A paper describes a structure:
Ras GTPase Activating Protein SH3 Domain Binding Protein (G3BP), a 52 kDa protein highly overexpressed in various cancer tumors, has in the last couple of years proved to be a significant cancer marker protein and a potential drug target. G3BP is involved in several cellular functions and is implicated for example in stress granule assembly, RNA metabolism and hereby cell motility, nuclear transportation and NFkappaB, Ras and Wnt signaling.
The 3.3 Å crystal structure of G3BP1 was solved in space group P6322 with one molecule in the asymmetric unit whereas two molecules describe the 1.6 Å structure in space group P212121.
Residue numbers in the entry:
A (entry chain A): 1 to 42, 52 to 137
B (entry chain B): 0 to 45, 51 to 116, 124 to 138
Write the structure that this text describes.
Amino acid sequence: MVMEKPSPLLVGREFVRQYYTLLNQAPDMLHRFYGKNSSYVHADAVYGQKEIHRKVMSQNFTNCHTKIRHVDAHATLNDGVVVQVMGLLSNNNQALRRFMQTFVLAPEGSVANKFYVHNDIFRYQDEV
Amino acid sequence: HMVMEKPSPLLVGREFVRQYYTLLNQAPDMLHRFYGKNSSYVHGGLPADAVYGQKEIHRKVMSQNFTNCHTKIRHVDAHATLNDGVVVQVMGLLSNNNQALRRFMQTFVLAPFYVHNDIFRYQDEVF
């Protein structure tokens, strides 16, 4: 069975599902989403899979619970997809906190329809 | 009167946001000039869908009747993205036409600047 390829919205929503699920289950594996040019800010940005992994591990994600309230995802430059996420996130069984998170997904360039995260920008509302 | 080093993505983002919200207050009828044929735009509403291209974006902006806007930009972060673009994340408060001050979350993608994507949501329509 063949079906037309996913829209940017489906791509974005599916990525969001993958990302937050992995953040709960095995945050030590999150680094697979990133490449050498990737930028992560969760505060100076850190770059590349190695440094991003280090930053993710330093946050001590444990039993991370996420409720996504809205996802916007749109085609952007050079076949990328820009994603805006609004939701609530909990870590270490503390209270849920509202956040927004902006992603830019970019074609990975070696596999059809495969994307990596070129930009990952997260901010809690309470800190702002 | 000199040649300055190219501004970092953060200065580009911050300066763009300044110009955008100033214009939103001074002349919203001119906001459409930021956008091109492949540009996406959404500005909250009930969630309302985005529109594409300068003509449809202008119509949308006009329909929103921006007037006597008060904007408080609490945070702006901006980073280099694909093909020397800049992705901007904005958090702040916006009051239109002397109505309620409402918290918003916004994302721009700027391309070498014009606006490729403008995603704005009010928190109170989502949370």
